[PDB]
């Protein structure tokens, strides 16, 4: 693939901007098509047994890539939960993108935590936005819930500017494990932030916090598609930039969007992308 330099992709910015943003318009049109010939089949969201599954009918989540849940006795679609496997920068399967949980759905979103190994949980939605809903809480307001057999005691609560970290302990009953949850709260409902600082501290902490060597790190907004892929594909690429001082938005892009559908869902939320980029290669 093809990494440009920092330098040439700064440069490069400065070009889809160009035109009235022709470039980004030209960009984002090849990412909505990549994978329209491709046939990527999503049998098991559309089965009619898992639709109330899915937060959304036609938000799905491709078969190749969708993370199973181990089968239960009694349904045999027990194992669907609409969350997919996606790379980050030099690793495979770094990520979970999953929908904002149903009440129906917090059992089976608990047991892919468990059945996952994952420790982080990324929350870039808040529950309500502008009168709509967008997420159900699936986790206690304080002290302990119980989620079939993981029980989720709440251990602390930090409320920064821009996001909330919440410090939990699951417990299987076939506290064990510990898993925090970061939760941007200041993403506005119409569009996407107008200062991308908030968003690179946010990104860069919470990334941080994805200790060795555990499962995905899981990513959710409402859909799971929009803010999760933003987040995905903004912190991939502060991990090459680290790495190798290059960056190729597009080209990773172009890769994910085959292992969830509309990652990076607007091309309002892929300039965004670069405008974060960029003030984090101006920074440090």
Known sequence: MEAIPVKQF?????????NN?????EDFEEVQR??????????????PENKHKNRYINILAYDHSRVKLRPLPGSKHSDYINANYVDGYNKA?????????LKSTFE????MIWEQNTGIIVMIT????????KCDQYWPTENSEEYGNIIVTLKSTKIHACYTVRRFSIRNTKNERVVIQYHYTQWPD?????????????????????????????????????????????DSMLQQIKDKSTVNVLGFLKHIRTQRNYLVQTEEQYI?????????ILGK
């Not at 790190?217 to 409402?222: K, T």
Request: proline letters at 5%; charged letters at 20%; hydrophobic letters at 40%.
């Open 108 to 111: 089976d979103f608990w047991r």
């Open 190 to 234: 119409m569009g996407v932030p107008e200062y991308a600082l908030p968003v690179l501290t946010f990104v860069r902490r919470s990334s941080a916090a994805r200790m060795p060597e555990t499962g995905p790190v899981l990513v959710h907004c409402s859909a799971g598609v929009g803010r999760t892929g933003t987040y995905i594909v903004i």
């Open 34 to 47: 990549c994978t329209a010939d491709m046939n990527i089949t999503a049998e098991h969201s559309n089965h």
């Open 272 to 280: 965004f992308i670069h405008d974060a980029l960029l003030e984090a």
């Open 126 to 133: 808040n529950l309500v936005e502008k009168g709509r809903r």
């Open 93 to 101: 399967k770094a990520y979970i993108a999953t929908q904002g949980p």
């Open 21 to 25: 943003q022709h470039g980004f318009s």
């Open 10 to 18: 700064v440069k490069h910015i400065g070009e889809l901007y160009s």
